[PDB]
A paper describes a structure:
Glycoprotein B (gB) refolds between prefusion and postfusion conformations to facilitate herpesvirus entry into host cells. Here we describe stabilization of the prefusion gB ectodomain from herpes simplex virus 1 (HSV-1), determine ectodomain structures at 2.9- to 4.1-Å resolution using cryogenic electron microscopy (cryo-EM) and isolate a prefusion-specific gB-neutralizing antibody termed WS.HSV-1.24. We used structure-based design to identify mutations encoding alterations capable of stabilizing the prefusion conformation of HSV-1 gB and determined both pre- and postfusion gB ectodomain structures. We propose that prefusion HSV-1 gB evades neutralization by most antibodies through an iso-surface display that is coupled to structural plasticity.
Cryo-electron tomography had previously identified the structure of a membrane-bound HSV-1 gB partially stabilized in its prefusion conformation by an H516P substitution. First, we characterized the impact of H516P in the context of a soluble ectodomain with an appended carboxy (C)-terminal phage T4 trimerization domain (foldon)31. We observed the H516P ectodomain gB with an appended foldon to assume the postfusion form under negative-stain electron microscopy, with single-particle cryogenic electron microscopy (cryo-EM) revealing that although the DIII helices were interrupted at residue 516, the H516P ectodomain with an appended foldon was nonetheless in the postfusion conformation.
Numbering used by the authors:
A (entry chain A), B (entry chain B), C (entry chain C): 111 to 474, 490 to 725
Write the structure that this text describes.
């Protein structure tokens, strides 16, 4: 440590303390509006409905009878459709099916007879039980073959009337549908003759379709004849007859599917966009502040009904006796393709402002389909960031406000501490060792000059020999400003300060014990006499500072993770059409010669 | 700035400082228990096993020989199954296959002869090589056709014995399985006659299935006869014969699949649920504190074996010489459908508490299948929030504790600063300019009255005319409480304070230089004489406050993002069954007349 | 509250305050390098190209004419390929197709004639319109059947030349491709005779493939003859002829697909790995600091072109007049399987350092395919954690630095407060009630002894009877160190301190009003006479502490959430190959007897 010599400060330089600053204002709280919400997503599930398929499994086989064996020289298999007359007057009316298959095939009016015998009404019976299969009924199980006749190619016909209940599936624009057997029906499931249903798509002749009003279906297993009538549609395809109940299109299909029902969906406005955050599901959405026209959604007649039902149910369940509805439900299109049906609410404690919020809330040729993203993590991350960033910022603001107040509060103490020891207060505030004097309401300063530690010596005795009973308050010292400069009489001061005047006089008292700072340690005195030097660590130390142990957040590495890779999902299927077709089509190239030609 | 006049305070009002407050206690550290863990997920991969399929590709064609050409009037193709007798005594025993196909078709015992010749044992040879295909063997490559005979419809038969090795797949409940060729086998892969295997599902007659004990398979390419025996199952379907090795069901299939092996899985208890957090994978799970009964998992025999093996391996690898096992492994069902197999551990430094942790850890008719969610982000977000919320809260608590300690620590300084300048300390603490007096251990206060800045004037000199050598410590002033009120003799004080007594007298000294606050600036004096006024900015300013630059966290917007949209995943398939079927079934409506009828 | 008695401190024990500590240094700012970036992902989309398929729908049917009906005894259907000669000289050259189908089937040169008549060139016309179907042309719509002849089995042939435009798809290694009709073509789409194309895969004889140079395609609907030539490839499969334009393999396929184009991709280096963070998409990647050799990517010729094009476009759009390019683009393989093409940039304000950054940036036998993960949440979570952890740590560091500076700053006040009241400052710093004395630059301490509250009594008056006009500054007291010990004369002090000397004398003054702390309250005096006792709450209290209201972050629970479960995605398909095949193959077991045999 170096010593310092400071001359008497004068008015050549003055300094003052900074006045209290204006601390930051508390940020305004965000305006959150409570309300119920329902989130909708793009509908990807095909329209499903029940249908009945009627057809006759006609088959004729040619058999060759050898001397001691029989061989099948050819087996022809074909599916024949059941006409409307039969499906209405025999199967449905009596549960019987004609044994003759009459239909058009390859532009020819072909006819077949079961066992080549005369026509006869055959009873329909349930088919053999099978696990995970819909109900089905048939009329014949044993295939008919010609009788044995040595050396002849005889023929035998078999007609097996079959009726089955299959699940039909359809997708947008719902212009066609498939059946459980994989057969395609190029006709809209909603095609008909009533209420503009004739405008639907149809790829068959007008005579191939028939609609029956007031149709009473008759179950085949149980012979009941239904309880209420229905509008039955019947189509005769080239290979089968399919029948299904007709229903209106608009209230039967919907392009949007209800995804979540949020009980508490807080909505805030900032940055020109609403923020719908749900604490229950931990998700945050963003819109454009303009209600999405619900009429623009193609086939979106289910959105309003489902939204209103869910809103009423949730309101009656929770907000029945605590809040009130403010305006009709609002619809907004959130980022990512999510349609949100919002319902603002207001607490009963401040219902007087209902008239002011109603009108403000009410202020918020073609159709299209909303495309919803397959990942919601973009919204969950937004909520997580907001859930942490918002509270952290609040605490940071409070710390800054409190810190500023503390500094202004301490200005009072410094105003008084400076008068007690201007040299110490001026040195720490100015940033360098300087002597100061109180020139009224402002303080003057003068820079000190350092002195080497080896260029100072302390007089052993502080006793003033001049007057007995008179002693000095600090030890006397001799110091040379230079390494070999003339020594300069002086007195020791506080904090290694060297004053050039031995004016600090005090009456000598018995039992004098003192310690004075000197360089990097202290100088011990006893009875006004120098005893010895001692290091700084020789005295017990007490920490006057408040310990704070802030620890930074450790870095983290997020490794990739997936529950099921895309390869695992693909492998989950029992059968693969691509692999099955590739292997099956290689049969000819593997087990046969595809180029050799034999002729004679 | 306004001036203030304060009267002598009296005992009419007193005030004291608040005593030190009790700072918050440090929150108790969370109880984390180390241990190894294994996470299981719902098994979606079908059960895969190897199987061999035997069948004869029987085909008979009718050829019409014209005057200068040949035409195929019809080609009949059918697959015939190989009986057990042949598969055991000819193919497996000698690698030969009979040239005659005898089987039941359409309820008729049909028979076919290769080339219409007598029966003969034909050798099996490998099929033509094909990329990405399993091994296969056949016996004939050239199709047989009748010899030319002008003007006749002649017939020719071809029997090609074919055997192939295909991959079989099955799914829960494993009551049936498929083959690489797309053929379905309605029989459980585990069906058999031993150890209750007969209770499995089977949709074929008892005579269509055969089991051979001690079966030694003979490879066809290499004529080796295997090294060890196996239990071979043989089923004769209506179109082919499939053979596969029989194995027990329970140790062959499992409804849960091992997903991750965590080396460090910290478990904590709070809120009535355990929290299994893994820092390695950055995932957090939640359970119900009750061990999930492992016996309730349907076909869950693999869970225990895999969990124990992984636990032992990880323990021997890392915790072999540092921790000890505490109790047997525990199983818990986490949210989302994840089964966690936990193994508590205890450090060797405190192994004496093993007896206390053992019993406590040990304290923690139908079956079902666990459904695992396809997204783990719900758990990763939980870990991320906890990984940030927990350390942030710890630092916030330390700041609050340290801040409270500092305030209590500073109470000592204010206890002494008030005695030096009661007016200043009382004004800042009370919140308004008030004069104070020290009435023992409590301080009195009196509110001051403001004075306009223009209603005060300073006397030019502080020299005492009636007593040379005596000067005033502050400049003299004259002020009127009102805008035009009688002026009131007074003296200037500290911080624009106006005292009503000129008692501050001091001996005049040469070189008098002072500055006194006056309104918004200062008043400079020299040799006890007014010099001029100067602004506050005219004096150098030093900031005694510690600058803190807290910056709030900027808002962020998370846009949607996906590596592969659901549409891209669907398009990844080489072939689509829906699109292929839709186009193929439109052939008749596109390239043919489906309504015109021709007759004569 | 307990009273305290402290003896005069001596030099037996001394204590000093801790000197100012070295506050932490501000952490160095992270080195972020601006630049443009392009992210690539694994290519899963199959290679798509247009192809034309030519084939003849040959069909011959056998009809049986009864006395009053007609029956189809068998219908043979087969697809015949169109030879190259016809496809080049009739269809393409004139739009006509021969009415005779000549081809090889079952190793026989079969021939068919339309309607059994002589050969004739038939015109090709467009097929019937169908929604969502490619163009197609045919030549016949009505099927031909034999004329009626009582009691006869007659045959009739129909040859319908059909040509269609289908979409071809292929996947890696591109050794085969499929068509829209589901047919497989075991030949590489890039097979040919020029520039080493003959090395591609091919599973057909050399005579089954033909390449035509300078081929001018002629549209069938519009009779235009194209505008430019092309290299046409022709393959004659066993059932059809497919033609497609030939193109080179390398510039036509790519194993990596451009995913995102980042305008601002900050790159930082720490921990031995680069961190590519994009604020626009909120994603962070990690690499190995070594540029991934672009030559190691199999069929990666598209990466360089796309990366350079995107880089140039983005640069010209934004960084054209503000930054400069530093070196050529760099390629790195990020975790998860993402290839990042980086382009470092440097601001124009410091372009002088270009020569120093250029060389440093430039310092950064087999092929493989990069496997990209299907989830990017691992990278988004990394960005979110870094986006919060980094700013939070910065503010925490500033608080710690500012807090340390404040403690060192307050050391000056304590250095002066100790001289005013050594007992109070020593008690709070040492931690226990101790009396202190100023032994120069160090302070001595002596522990006090507590005294019970009931063992002290205060005299009624402090009037000094011996000297009228002289009063005591504090009330006189009598206290016994023990419960029944001799009472000890004394005087009351500050903070319930009891001094053993009545030396605090002051001149009596009129209007004496004081309050002194006594136990848990105060003792009120008037005119140097005891008045009464009063509680601590009886005096108005003003809080001198700065209130901080830190609030911890509340816990949060993240419930599972998915937009579309894996089951919903599977159900989105209109048709399922597995379910369709399972039901179709059960037809025999459901509607027929598979074991009964009939013979005679
Ligand atoms: C919110 O409104 C903005 C416009 O203010 C929409 O952004 C526009 O979208 C159209 C779509 O055709 C683009 O052509 C425009 O270029 C976009 N404009 C801008 C300024 O970006 C945005 O799509 C709306 N968002 C939602 C969720 O509806
Ligand atoms: C944890 O235990 C709770 C009950 O304490 C389970 O919640 C119940 O689940 C059943 C399922 O049938 C419901 O019927 C009950 O209504 C639920 N009760 C409550 C209070 O919510 C919960 O499923 C258990 N969680 C796990 C992961 O096992
Ligand atoms: C980064 O480099 C490390 C090695 O420094 C790679 O890790 C090695 O990967 C090989 C792959 O065959 C393993 O066999 C080694 O055991 C791994 N070594 C270590 C030390 O883990 C790592 O794959 C590289 N990462 C990227 C993204 O390229
Ligand atoms: C919105 O916040 C402002 C303050 O920023 C407040 O005055 C106003 O009342 C709030 N409005 C609503 C509707 O909450
Ligand atoms: C809902 O509140 C109405 C009054 O507004 C009350 O009559 C009704 O019983 C309440 N229903 C429930 C379920 O609390
Ligand atoms: C601060 O924390 C560190 C790490 O726990 C510890 O070593 C140090 O002693 C602490 N300092 C205190 C409590 O003053
Ligand atoms: C749990 O924490 C408490 C303090 O909250 C502690 O006393 C106890 O020992 C801890 N127990 C375990 C098992 O860690
Ligand atoms: C594991 O510890 C055992 C003693 O408990 C020791 O014998 C063995 O060698 C150790 N194995 C390893 C791999 O460290
Ligand atoms: C606080 O930070 C702002 C922004 O960097 C800066 O402009 C200001 O000067 C800082 N104040 C300080 C360092 O006192
Ligand atoms: C990297 O940071 C160091 C300080 O840590 C700095 O000196 C150096 O200039 C920086 N380099 C670059 C390229 O930004
Ligand atoms: C880009 O900068 C060049 C000069 O470097 C200038 O000539 C050109 O016009 C600029 N282009 C744009 C689009 O700003
Ligand atoms: C601190 O916050 C709590 C909760 O808002 C409040 O009750 C308390 O009065 C606050 N203390 C203050 C502002 O001093």
């Amino acid at each position: 440590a170096n010593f310092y010599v400071c001359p008497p400060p004068t008015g050549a330089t003055v300094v003052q303390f900074e006045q209290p600053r204006r601390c930051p204002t508390r940020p305004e709280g965000q305006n959150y509006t409570e309300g119920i919400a329902v989130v909708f997503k793009e509908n990807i599930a095909p329209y499903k409905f029940k249908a009945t398929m009627y057809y006759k499994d006609v088959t004729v086989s040619q058999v060759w009878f050898g001397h001691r064996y029989s061989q099948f020289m050819g087996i022809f298999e074909d599916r024949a459709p059941v006409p409307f007359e039969e499906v209405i007057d025999k199967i449905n009316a009596k549960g019987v099916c004609r044994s003759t298959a009459k239909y058009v095939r390859n532009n020819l009016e072909t006819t077949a007879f079961h066992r080549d015998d005369h026509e006869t009404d055959m009873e329909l019976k349930p088919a053999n039980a099978a696990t995970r299969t819909s109900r089905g009924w048939h009329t014949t199980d044993l295939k008919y073959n010609p009788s044995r006749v040595e050396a002849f190619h005889r023929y035998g016909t078999t007609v097996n009337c079959i009726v089955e209940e299959v699940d039909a599936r359809s997708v947008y624009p719902y212009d066609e549908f498939v059946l459980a057997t994989g057969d395609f029906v190029y006709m809209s499931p909603f095609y008909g003759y009533r209420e503009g249903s004739h405008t639907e798509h149809t790829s068959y002749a007008a005579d191939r379709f028939k609609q029956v009003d007031g149709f009473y279906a008759r179950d085949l297993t149980t012979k009941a004849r239904a309880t209420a009538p229905t509008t039955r549609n019947l189509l005769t395809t080239p290979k089968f007859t399919v029948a299904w109940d007709w229903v209106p299109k608009r209230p039967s299909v919907c392009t949007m599917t209800k995804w979540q029902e949020v009980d508490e969906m807080l909505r805030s406005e900032y940055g020109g966009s609403f923020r719908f955050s749900s604490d229950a599901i931990s998700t945050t959405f963003t819109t454009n502040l303009t209600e999405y026209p619900l009429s623009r959604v193609d086939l979106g007649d289910c959105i309003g009904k489902d939204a209103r039902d869910a809103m009423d149910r949730i309101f009656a369940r929770r907000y029945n006796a605590t809040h009130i509805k403010v305006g009709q439900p609002q619809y907004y299109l959130a980022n990512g393709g999510f349609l949100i049906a919002y319902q603002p609410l207001l607490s009963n404690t401040l219902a007087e402002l209902y008239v002011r919020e109603h009108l403000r809330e009410q202020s918020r040729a073609s159709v299209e389909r909303i495309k919803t993203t397959s990942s919601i993590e973009f919204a969950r991350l937004q909520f997580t960031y907001n859930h942490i960033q918002r509270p952290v910022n609040d605490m940071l603001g409070r710390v800054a406000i409190a810190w500023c107040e503390l500094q202004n509060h301490e200005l009072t103490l410094w105003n008084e501490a400076r008068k007690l020891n201007p040299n110490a207060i001026a040195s720490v505030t100015v940033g360098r060792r300087v002597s100061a004097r109180m020139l009224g309401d402002v303080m003057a300063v003068s820079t000190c000059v350092p002195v080497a530690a080896d260029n100072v010596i302390v007089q052993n005795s502080m006793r003033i020999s001049s007057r007995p009973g008179a002693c000095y308050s600090r030890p006397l010292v001799s110091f040379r400003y230079e390494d070999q400069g003339p020594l300069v009489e002086g007195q020791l001061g506080e904090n290694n300060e060297l004053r050039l005047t031995r004016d600090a006089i005090e009456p000598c008292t018995v039992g004098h014990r003192r310690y004075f700072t000197f360089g990097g340690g202290y100088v011990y005195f006893e009875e006004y006499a120098y005893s010895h030097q001692l290091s700084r660590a020789d005295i017990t130390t007490v920490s006057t500072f408040i310990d704070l142990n802030i620890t930074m957040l450790e870095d983290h590495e997020f490794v990739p993770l997936e529950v099921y890779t895309r390869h695992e999902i693909k492998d989950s299927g029992l059968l693969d059409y691509t692999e099955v077709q590739r292997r099956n089509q290689l049969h000819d190239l593997r087990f046969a010669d595809i180029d050799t030609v034999i002729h004679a």
